[PDB]
Curated annotation (Swiss-Prot), chain A:
Compositional bias per record (Basic and acidic residues), positions renumbered to this chain: 8-21
Keyword presence, Ion transport: no
Family assignment from sequence similarity: Belongs to the eukaryotic ribosomal protein eL32 family.
Biased composition (Basic residues): 38-64
GO MF, one example: nucleotide binding
Protein name: Large ribosomal subunit protein eL32
Record note on quaternary structure: Part of the 50S ribosomal subunit. Interacts weakly with protein L15.
Annotated stretches, region: Disordered: 1-87
GO BP: DNA repair; translation
Keyword terms: Ribonucleoprotein, Ribosomal protein, RNA-binding, rRNA-binding
UniProtKB/Swiss-Prot annotation, chain B:
Listed InterPro entries: Ribosomal_uL13, Ribosomal_uL13_bac-type, Ribosomal_uL13_CS, Ribosomal_uL13_euk/arc, Ribosomal_uL13_sf
Origin superkingdom: Archaea
Protein family per UniProt: Belongs to the universal ribosomal protein uL13 family.
Subunit structure: Part of the 50S ribosomal subunit. Interacts weakly with proteins L3 and L6.
Source organism of this protein record: Haloarcula marismortui (strain ATCC 43049 / DSM 3752 / JCM 8966 / VKM B-1809)
Gene Ontology cellular component terms for the protein in this record: cytosolic large ribosomal subunit
Name the UniProt record assigns to this protein: Large ribosomal subunit protein uL13
Purpose of the protein: This protein is one of the early assembly proteins of the 50S ribosomal subunit. Binds to 23S rRNA.
GO MF term set: mRNA binding; rRNA binding; structural constituent of ribosome
BP-aspect Gene Ontology terms: negative regulation of translation; translation
Keywords: Ribonucleoprotein, Ribosomal protein, RNA-binding, rRNA-binding
Swiss-Prot record, chain C:
HAMAP family: Ribosomal_uL22_A (MF_01331_A)
Swiss-Prot/TrEMBL keywords: Ribonucleoprotein, Ribosomal protein, RNA-binding, rRNA-binding
Subunit structure as annotated in this protein's UniProt entry: Part of the 50S ribosomal subunit. Contacts the macrolide antibiotic tylosin in the polypeptide exit tunnel.
Biological process, per Gene Ontology: cytoplasmic translation
PROSITE patterns: RIBOSOMAL_L22
Pfam families: Ribosomal_L22
Known function: This protein binds specifically to 23S rRNA. It makes multiple contacts with different domains of the 23S rRNA in the assembled 50S subunit and ribosome.
Organism annotation: Haloarcula marismortui (strain ATCC 43049 / DSM 3752 / JCM 8966 / VKM B-1809) (Halobacterium marismortui)
Listed name of the protein: Large ribosomal subunit protein uL22
Gene name in the database record: rpl22
Family per record: Belongs to the universal ribosomal protein uL22 family.
InterPro entries: Ribosomal_uL22, Ribosomal_uL22_CS, Ribosomal_uL22_euk/arc, Ribosomal_uL22_sf
Gene Ontology MF annotations: rRNA binding; structural constituent of ribosome
One of the record's GO cellular component terms: cytosolic large ribosomal subunit
RNA sequence: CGCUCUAAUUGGAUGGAAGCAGGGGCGAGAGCUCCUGUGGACCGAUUAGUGACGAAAAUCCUGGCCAUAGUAGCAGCGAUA
RNA sequence: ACCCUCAGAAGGGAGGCGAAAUAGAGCAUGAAAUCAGUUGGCGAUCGAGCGACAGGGCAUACAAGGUCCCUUGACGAAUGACCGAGACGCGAGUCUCCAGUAAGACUCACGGGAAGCCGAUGUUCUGUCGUACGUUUUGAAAAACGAGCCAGGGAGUGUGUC
C-alpha cells in the first residue's frame, strides 16, 4: 500500500547527561558558512574555503562584515565533534562482516553508495536483528 | 480634505525647531501628527540674518534641482523632514503620516507641547514664518 | 537540434517543429511570444497581416533603435519581420495538417507552446579593411509548436 | 586535506561503478559522506611508495559563449538607370 | 517500411527497430559560460563591492536532517531592582533598610501545541558593519596596473660537488 523504511529508523542512543548537553550546544551555537571570499562575486571563484592571502584583503584584515576567517577557537567540543544530529556515532559499512564490533546503543550504521540492492538487503536485515539503526534505509512497498 | 490625526499641535508662538523635533519623535512612535497654524509659527534671531539664509536656499539649485519651499506651509514640512530619515522605509511612513496646515482645518484646538512656547513679553528678536514667506516671494493666502 | 521542452497527451494534442532555419532568432522570439495563447487560425491571419505590413510584432527585448508603431498595445517599439513570419506560417501549416490527419479541427486549436531556440550559426567571413576579416554569420533556428484542444 | 600510478592487506559493482544535476549529514577547514535523478562499466579503503600533483589573477595559452545589436556597412567615385 | 504534410531523397507528424533513439549519423557520457520556454521570490517613489552575522514575509512531494512554540516548574554566573518605611539635599537627585532578595543566559521536567512545522534550501524585507580581488606602494575603493564570462591548460625540476 505505502512506503515503509527497513530497520529501526526511530532509534536513539543513550548518552551521558554531559554529551547530550554538548550536542544541544553544537546544534544551538553552530558555526558560520566559512565560504571563500567573494565566491558570490565571481563564478570562477568557488565556494570551497581558501585563506585570504592578500595584503589588503578586508576579510584578512579582520574588518567586520566581510566574513569570519577559519580559526582554532571555532571548533566543536571534543566530546561531540563528528556525531550525527541524532547523537549517534557513524560507522561506515561495505559488507555484512563490517557489522561486527558495533554497539547499537551508541553507533548507528551508514552503508556506502557503491553497494547494490542484493547486498543491501543482507546488511539491512542483519542490522535489525543485531539492534543497529541504518541511517540510509531502503524504502519498501508495504 | 480629511486626515485622521492622533495628535494636533498648535504652532502659535512656538519655537519651530523645538516643535518639529517633538513631532518627529512622535511620528516614529507611530503617531499621526498634524501641525496647525504654521503661518503663526516662530523662529528666534535677527530678521535680517534669518531671511538671508532662507533667501539663499531659494537661489540654490541646478538642472538636477533643489526645491525649497517659500510658503510657511512647506517650510515647516521640510524642517520635519530634516529630523527624520525620510529616505528609509520607516522614516517615509512616519513623515507621510505628518501634515502641516495653514490655520486650522479642524474644529478642535491644537495643544501646545511643553517647552516649545515663546514669551513675547520677554522677547522682541524673532520672526513669523509668514513674514519670512512674504519676503521670499509667496502670496499671502492665510 | 532540440526536443520538445514540454509534455503532451496525444489524444488532446498535435505537435509540430521547425529545424535549422536560417532566419533571425531575435525576430523568432517576439513572433513566438505574440502568437502564444492565440488560435492556430487567429495566428495564421495575424502573420499574413504582418507580411503585408498591417499588424506589427512588438519587439520587446530586441528593440534598440527601432521606431515606435501606433498599432502596438502596452508597448512602443515594433516591426514587421516577414521572413520569419513566412517560416512560422510553414510551422502552422504543418501543424494543422498533422492535426487534421488525427481528426482535430486545426484552425480551432490553441497554441499551448511556441518557443525559439538558437541552434548555432552558419559561419561566414567578411573582408574588412587593413588586411583583416571579421565574422559574418547567419543564425540557424529551431522552433517548436504544440496545439491543444480547448 | 586532495590528485596520479606502483606494491602489500582487504573491499565494493549490471540487484547498476565512475562522471554529472539537484538535495540531506559531517569536519574550524582543506575536504568527507549519504539520498534522488542521469549514466551503463568500472570504483575504492588502509599501509608504504611515485610525482608532468592542487589556480582567480601573469595586457597568461587554447576553446566556447554573452553584451555590444538587429547596431555600423550593403549611399558618396563625372559610370546616379 | 508504410501513411499523411510539403515545391521537396529536405524538414515535420504518425509510425517502425533496439534494453536504450534524450544511442538516429562529429550519433558513449554531456560540466560551465550562455539561450529559449517556464516555476518560486522581488518588482515601474526609488540608491550602488552585490555580502557576513541577526531577525521577519513568502515558497518547498519523498529520500539522505527532525526538531520547534507557549502556560507552568526546577536549576540559577557576573549583574541586579520597583513600591514601601526612615533619614539628608536650593536642586535634578541621594543614603540606609527592604535584599545580593525579585529578577537573571543556558539546560531540564510535567502538561499542552505546530509537520512547511524546526532545520535546511531559494528569494526578499529590516538591523548591524561594509568604497571587490590580486599587485605595486610610506599610503589602493582609487582618476596607479590586470581581467568581458566560463572551461581546460598554466610556474622550486635534474645531475654533479659542498
Ligand atoms: Cl584542531
Ligand atoms: Cl533649481
Ligand atoms: Cl535618510
Ligand atoms: Cl529679544
Ligand atoms: Cl542572435
Ligand atoms: Cl548548557
Ligand atoms: Cl619551494
Ligand atoms: Mg561562484
Ligand atoms: Mg532609429
Ligand atoms: Mg590587403
Ligand atoms: Mg591493508
Ligand atoms: Mg587544473
Ligand atoms: Mg593567486
Ligand atoms: Mg548604439
Ligand atoms: Mg541618369
Ligand atoms: Mg550523443
Ligand atoms: Mg609611491
Ligand atoms: Na533659530
Ligand atoms: Na531653489
Ligand atoms: Na528591452
Ligand atoms: Na501603443
Ligand atoms: Na495603441
Ligand atoms: Na528566509
Ligand atoms: Na602591479
Ligand atoms: Na586593491
Ligand atoms: Na584615486
Ligand atoms: Na571580444
Ligand atoms: Sr550510487
Ligand atoms: Sr524626546
Ligand atoms: Sr534591449
Ligand atoms: Sr541542463
Ligand atoms: Sr602543474
Ligand atoms: Sr554575436
Ligand atoms: Sr544606388
Ligand atoms: Sr568615401
Ligand atoms: Sr517517433
Ligand atoms: Sr549617498
Ligand atoms: Sr542566586
Amino acid at each position: 500500500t505505502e512506503l515503509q523504511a527497513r530497520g529501526l529508523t526511530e532509534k536513539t542512543p543513550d548518552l551521558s547527561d554531559e554529551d547530550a548537553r554538548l550536542l544541544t550546544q553544537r546544534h544551538r551555537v553552530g558555526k558560520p558558512q566559512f565560504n571563500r571570499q567573494d565566491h558570490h562575486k565571481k563564478k570562477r571563484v568557488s565556494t570551497s574555503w581558501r585563506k585570504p592571502r592578500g595584503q589588503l584583503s578586508k576579510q584578512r584584515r579582520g574588518i567586520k562584515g566581510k566574513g569570519d576567517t577559519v580559526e582554532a577557537g571555532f571548533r566543536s567540543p571534543t566530546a561531540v565533534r563528528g556525531k550525527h544530529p541524532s547523537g549517534f556515532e557513524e560507522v561506515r559499512v561495505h559488507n555484512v562482516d563490517d557489522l561486527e564490533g558495533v554497539d547499537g546503543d551508541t553507533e548507528a550504521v551508514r552503508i556506502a553508495s557503491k553497494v547494490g540492492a542484493r547486498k543491501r538487503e543482507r546488511i539491512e536485515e542483519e542490522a535489525e536483528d543485531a539492534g543497529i539503526r541504518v541511517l540510509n534505509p531502503t524504502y519498501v512497498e508495504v | 480634505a480629511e486626515f485622521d490625526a492622533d495628535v494636533i499641535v498648535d504652532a502659535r508662538d512656538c519655537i519651530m525647531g523645538r516643535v518639529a523635533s517633538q513631532v518627529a519623535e512622535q511620528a516614529l512612535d507611530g503617531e499621526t501628527v498634524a501641525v496647525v497654524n504654521a503661518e503663526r509659527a516662530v523662529i528666534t534671531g535677527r530678521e535680517e540674518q534669518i531671511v538671508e539664509k532662507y533667501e539663499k536656499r531659494v537661489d540654490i539649485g541646478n538642472d538636477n534641482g533643489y526645491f525649497y519651499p517659500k510658503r510657511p506651509d512647506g517650510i515647516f514640512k521640510r524642517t520635519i523632514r530634516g529630523m527624520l530619515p525620510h529616505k528609509k522605509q520607516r522614516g517615509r511612513e512616519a513623515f507621510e503620516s505628518v501634515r502641516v496646515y495653514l490655520g486650522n482645518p479642524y474644529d478642535e484646538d491644537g495643544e501646545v507641547l511643553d517647552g516649545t512656547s515663546l514669551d513675547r513679553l520677554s522677547n522682541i528678536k524673532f520672526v513669523t514664518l509668514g513674514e519670512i514667506s512674504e519676503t521670499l516671494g509667496a502670496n499671502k493666502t492665510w | 537540434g532540440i526536443s520538445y521542452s514540454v509534455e503532451a497527451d496525444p489524444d488532446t494534442t498535435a505537435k509540430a517543429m521547425l529545424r535549422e532555419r536560417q532566419m533571425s532568432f531575435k525576430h523568432s522570439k517576439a513572433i513566438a511570444r505574440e502568437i502564444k495563447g492565440k488560435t492556430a487560425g487567429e495566428a495564421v491571419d495575424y502573420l499574413e497581416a504582418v507580411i503585408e505590413g498591417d499588424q506589427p510584432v512588438p519587439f520587446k527585448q530586441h528593440n534598440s533603435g527601432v521606431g515606435h508603431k501606433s498599432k502596438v498595445d502596452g508597448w512602443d517599439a515594433g516591426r514587421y519581420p516577414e521572413k520569419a513570419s513566412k517560416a512560422f506560417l510553414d510551422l502552422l501549416e504543418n501543424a494543422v495538417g498533422n492535426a487534421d490527419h488525427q481528426g482535430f479541427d486545426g484552425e480551432a486549436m490553441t497554441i499551448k507552446h511556441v518557443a525559439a531556440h538558437k541552434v548555432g550559426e552558419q559561419q561566414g567571413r567578411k573582408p574588412r579593411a587593413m588586411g583583416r576579416a571579421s565574422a559574418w554569420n547567419s543564425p540557424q533556428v529551431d522552433v517548436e509548436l504544440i496545439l491543444e484542444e480547448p
